[PDB]
Amino acid sequence: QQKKTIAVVNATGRQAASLIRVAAAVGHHVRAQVHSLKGLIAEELQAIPNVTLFQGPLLNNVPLMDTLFEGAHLAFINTTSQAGDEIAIGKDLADAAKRAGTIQHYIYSSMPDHSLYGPWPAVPMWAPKFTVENYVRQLGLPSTFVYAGIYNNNFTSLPYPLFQMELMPDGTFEWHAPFDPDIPLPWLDAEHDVGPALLQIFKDGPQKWNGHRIALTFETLSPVQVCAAFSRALNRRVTYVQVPKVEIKVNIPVGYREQLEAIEVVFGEHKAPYFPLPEFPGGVISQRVTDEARKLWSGWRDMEEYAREVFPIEEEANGLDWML
Numbered sequence: 001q002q003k004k005t006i007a008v009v010n011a012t013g014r015q016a017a018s019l020i021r022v023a024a025a026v027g028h029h030v031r032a033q034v035h036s037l038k039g040l041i042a043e044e045l046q047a048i049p050n051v052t053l054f055q056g057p058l059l060n061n062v063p064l065m066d067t068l069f070e071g072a073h074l075a076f077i078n079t080t081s082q083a084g085d086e087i088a089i090g091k092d093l094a095d096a097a098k099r100a101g102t103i104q105h106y107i108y109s110s111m112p113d114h115s116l117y118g119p120w121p122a123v124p125m126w127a128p129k130f131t132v133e134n135y136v137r138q139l140g141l142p143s144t145f146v147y148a149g150i151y152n153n154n155f156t157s158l159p160y161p162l163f164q165m166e167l168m169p170d171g172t173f174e175w176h177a178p179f180d181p182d183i184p185l186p187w188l189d190a191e192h193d194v195g196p197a198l199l200q201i202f203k204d205g206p207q208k209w210n211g212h213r214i215a216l217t218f219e220t221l222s223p224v225q226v227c228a229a230f231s232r233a234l235n236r237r238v239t240y241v242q243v244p245k246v247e248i249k250v251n252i253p254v255g256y257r258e259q260l261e262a263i264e265v266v267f268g269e270h271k272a273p274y275f276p277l278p279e280f281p282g283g284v285i286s287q288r289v290t291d292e293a294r295k296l297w298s299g300w301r302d303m304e305e306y307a308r309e310v311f312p313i314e315e316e317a318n319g320l321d322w323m324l
């Protein structure tokens with residue numbers, strides 16, 4: 001079984017980059033689109049022999065999409081709002097993959113539209129992906145949809161919104177967010193675990209996974225449990241503080257601000273599930289949201305491992321020195 005060529009977009013993003021590194025390591029050639037060739041990650045991927053980068057915007061650039069899928073047999077597509085009209089781009093990519101005629105398994109990274117499951121607003125950077133998912137489903141090629149849990153590495157002590165592990169004057173850390181302190185949230189070590197899981201889906205094949213939604217989360221932890229993991233990892237006091245509104249301490253694009261306001265309503269006010277879809281006596285065993293992901297990849301890393309082994313390095317690389 002010669003490893004098939006995988007087409008991917010937004011290659012410098014955490015999800016795609018995770019897949020590209022391990023896919024290339026096991027023999028897959030990769031055709032990857034990047035908005036630009038500069039940057040540490042783009043440079044890193046360009047140096048991988050099995051990888052070929054195609055620089056250019058996706059917005060209104062079907063020709064680049066046709067080039068990307070040329071000769072590819074598999075695809076992993078994860079769009080971002082930074083590239084622009086996510087729905088238009090997601091549909092254009094799906095169409096280009098079908099037109100290539102060689103795509104045997106198309107994995108699209110989707111997210112929920114909360115407004116379909118309760119008296120909740122749609123989270124703006126998530127709902128559009130669900131529209132693309134519906135469109136992909138009606139295309140004549142096998143497709144699978146993965147839903148990413150919250151990234152372990154969203155955490156930083158820099159003053160960025162929602163996931164700031166704030167370093168206090170006394171050396172302790174505090175994480176302030178709207179999430180209920182005790183409701184478990186789905187987490188994901190994006191860099192280490194997205195790739196391996198995706199590869200297993202491709203290995204399993206389209207017959208087993210066509211039409212399926214898979215939650216890419218390997219651990220559920222309430223905010224209090226997250227802080228306890230950081231505390232054990234760093235041997236420091238780390239405490240969770242539930243706040244009504246997201247503390248926005250830096251300037252952000254308006255689209256992100258609307259995303260955060262939706263999060264305050266969805267999670268702060270309504271305590272709705274992160275994955276609101278329905279699917280997410282003796283011997284009767286109900287499936288946990290982490291079941292399929294763990295079956296796909298047993299080598300996943302938890303929050304405590306991230307906090308102890310990676311967080312200190314990412315923090316130092318960002319110039320912080322609490323770990324010095």
Ligand SMILES: NC(=O)c1ccc[n+]([C@@H]2O[C@H](COP(=O)([O-])OP(=O)(O)OC[C@H]3O[C@@H](n4cnc5c(N)ncnc54)[C@H](OP(=O)(O)O)[C@@H]3O)[C@@H](O)[C@H]2O)c1
Pocket residue numbers: 010011012013014015016035036038039041042078079080081082083084111125126147148149150151154
């Ligand atoms: N973080 C979470 O907890 C979480 C959970 C579930 C789903 N998601 C979804 O994940 C998606 C993001 O994917 P990701 O995590 O793999 O990416 P990511 O790591 O957040 O990286 C974002 C990327 O977009 C690039 N970029 C910057 N400006 C751009 C522009 N104007 N046009 C095109 N690309 C541009 C950046 O490249 P350079 O910096 O190299 O230029 C970077 O590679 C989002 O749609 C988000 O909703 C996130």
Ligand SMILES: [Cl-]
Pocket residue numbers: 002003004202
């Ligand atoms: Cl293969």
Ligand SMILES: [Cl-]
Pocket residue numbers: 005029030031052071
């Ligand atoms: Cl190639």
Ligand SMILES: [Cl-]
Pocket residue numbers: 009010011012013033034035036
């Ligand atoms: Cl990119």
Ligand SMILES: [Cl-]
Pocket residue numbers: 140
């Ligand atoms: Cl047909």
Ligand SMILES: [Cl-]
Pocket residue numbers: 158159166249
């Ligand atoms: Cl701060």
Ligand SMILES: [Cl-]
Pocket residue numbers: 223224227228238239240
């Ligand atoms: Cl706490």
Ligand SMILES: [Cl-]
Pocket residue numbers: 249250251252
């Ligand atoms: Cl700012």
Ligand SMILES: [Cl-]
Pocket residue numbers: 185186273274275276
């Ligand atoms: Cl959930």
Ligand SMILES: [K+]
Pocket residue numbers: 045046047048049050051052053
């Ligand atoms: K290369």
Ligand SMILES: [K+]
Pocket residue numbers: 115116117118119120
């Ligand atoms: K509704």
Ligand SMILES: [K+]
Pocket residue numbers: 136137138139140141142143
């Ligand atoms: K399909």
Ligand SMILES: [K+]
Pocket residue numbers: 138139140
């Ligand atoms: K069709």
Ligand SMILES: [K+]
Pocket residue numbers: 109110111146147148
């Ligand atoms: K996703």
